[PDB]
């Protein structure tokens, strides 16, 4: 019960498109693992991050020898962990000896 008037979620300004001066800027050279190089022009006064998500789609590091060592998290949950939270070492060793005796009796009896 209205008029179909659409608008994309974003504004359109118009200022002076001058290219004679800009802000000064650096260029950081990022490198992924598979021999790729990438250039990302940051500004001058900009804290350049040691890692970066590259255009290729993989997390590339910075080519300067920073060596940040971010100390990543543990692998979340294993089947061994879900076994160990409900069993104990001696009971698992008991079932291990049970299956060892069964494979022995199947092998030579």
């Amino acid at each position: 019960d209205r008029v179909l008037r659409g608008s994309r979620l974003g504004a359109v300004s118009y200022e002076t498109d001058r290219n004679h001066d800009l802000a000064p800027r650096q260029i950081a050279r990022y490198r992924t693992d598979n021999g790729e190089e990438f250039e990302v022009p940051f500004a001058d006064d900009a804290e350049i991050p040691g890692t970066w998500l590259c255009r290729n789609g993989m997390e590339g590091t910075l080519i300067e020898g920073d060596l940040p060592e971010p100390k990543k998290v543990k692998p979340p949950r294993t089947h061994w962990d879900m076994l160990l939270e409900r069993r104990s070492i001696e009971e698992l060793e008991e079932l291990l000896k049970e299956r060892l005796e069964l494979i022995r009796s199947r092998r030579r009896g």
Binding site: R5, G6, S7, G10, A11, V12
Partner: protein, 87 residues
């Protein structure tokens, strides 16, 4: 598509810029320069009163008095009868 260009207000904006150039150039050099630096016409960022006092070799109070006197000047009908229809 409401985010497109209405294409009569753009050329009206261009003629408004030229009319404002004529009106600002009917005054002197210090007044027009202080006004354009104050409201940011030659550049994007408007220079503040301290910036214009730095670029003009004066204090900011002289800049502010010049600004007040020019804004009292520009509300004349002789400098308003052409710009009234632009709003």
């Amino acid at each position: 598509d409401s985010e497109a260009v209405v294409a009569v207000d753009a050329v009206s904006f261009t003629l408004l810029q030229d009319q404002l150039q004529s009106v600002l150039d009917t005054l002197s050099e210090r007044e027009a320069g202080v006004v354009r630096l104050r409201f940011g016409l030659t550049d994007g960022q408007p220079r503040t009163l301290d910036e214009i006092g730095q670029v003009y070799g004066v204090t900011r109070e002289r800049i502010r008095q010049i600004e007040s006197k020019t804004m009292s000047k520009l509300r004349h009908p002789s400098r308003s009868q052409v710009l009234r229809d632009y709003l």
